[PDB]
Amino acid sequence: MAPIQEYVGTLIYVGVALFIGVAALLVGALLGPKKPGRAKLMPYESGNDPAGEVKRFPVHFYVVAMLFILFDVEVAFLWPYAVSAGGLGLYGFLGVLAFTLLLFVGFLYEWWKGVMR
């Protein structure tokens, strides 16, 4: 069960953090000299820009991201199972086991193939 109270408490926590946040920033905004750059606005790779080529970049990042989603969903379910489990007995367990094995295929596919593509 739960007290509605603690959710209130949640909101509390967040509001505090934001104030202190904002305080730091208000300091930041107003303080210091008001002297601008005009060429320090150009990047730090030695004053060099990373500009030199513009192209399309690895699907690697997609792959990982996508992966994570699926498995995050996986996890999602295993939490309820975690809650009610022994009470669900062996039939509980078997279902989950099946399911799990399915997602393991995703992994395995990617193990022989390799995430680097």
Partner 1 sequence: MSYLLTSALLFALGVYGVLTRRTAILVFLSIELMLNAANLSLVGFARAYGLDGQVAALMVIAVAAAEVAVGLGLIVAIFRHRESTAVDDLSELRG
Partner 2 sequence: MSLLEGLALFLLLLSGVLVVTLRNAIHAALALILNFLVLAGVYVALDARFLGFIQVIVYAGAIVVLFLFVIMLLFAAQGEIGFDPLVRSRPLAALLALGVAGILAAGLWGLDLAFTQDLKGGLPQALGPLLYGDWLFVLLAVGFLLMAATVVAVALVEPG
Partner 3 sequence: MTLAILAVFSVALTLLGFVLPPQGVKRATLLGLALALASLLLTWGKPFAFGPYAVDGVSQVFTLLALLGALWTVGLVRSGRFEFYLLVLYAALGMHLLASTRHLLLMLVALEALSLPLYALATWRRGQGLEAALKYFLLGALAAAFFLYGAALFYGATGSLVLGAPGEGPLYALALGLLLVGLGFKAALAPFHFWTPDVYQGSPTPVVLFMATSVKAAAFAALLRVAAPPEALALLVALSVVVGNLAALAQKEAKRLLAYSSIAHAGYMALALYTGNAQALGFYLLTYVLATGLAFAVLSQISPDRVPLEALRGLYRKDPLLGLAFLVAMLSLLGLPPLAGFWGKYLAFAEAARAGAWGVLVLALVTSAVSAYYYLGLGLAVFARPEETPFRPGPPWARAAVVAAGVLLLALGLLPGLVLPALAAGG
- For binding to partner 1 (CB under 8 A), which residues are involved? 56, 59, 62, 66, 69-70, 73, 76
**Could you say which of 44, 61, 111, 112 contacts partner 2 (CB under 8 A)?**
61
Q: Is 109 in the site for partner 3 (CB under 8 A)?
A: yes
Shortest distance, CB of residue 113 to partner 3, whole angstroms? 9
CB 85 within 8 A of CB 92: yes
Binders of partner 3 among residues 69 to 108 (CB under 8 A) are 101-102, 105, 108
41-76 exposure pattern, b = at least 16 Cβ within 10 A, e = fewer: eeeeeeeeeeeeeeeeeeeeeeeeeeeeeeeeeeee
**Backbone angle region of 35, left / alpha / beta, with phi > 0 → left and psi within -120 to 50 → alpha:** beta
Q: Are 64 and 114 in contact (CB under 8 A)?
A: no
Site for partner 2 in 65-104 (CB under 8 A): 65-70, 72-74, 76-77, 79-81, 83-85, 87-88, 91-92, 95, 98-99, 102-103
Residues 42, 49 contacting (CB under 8 angstroms) = yes
Binding residues for partner 2, rule CB under 8 A, total 41
What is the Rg, in whole angstroms, of the alpha carbon atoms belonging to the chain? 25
Judged by the rule CB under 8 A, the positions of this chain that interact with partner 2 are 1-2, 7, 56-57, 59, 61-63, 65-70, 72-74, 76-77, 79-81, 83-85, 87-88, 91-92, 95, 98-99, 102-103, 105-106, 109-110, 113, 117
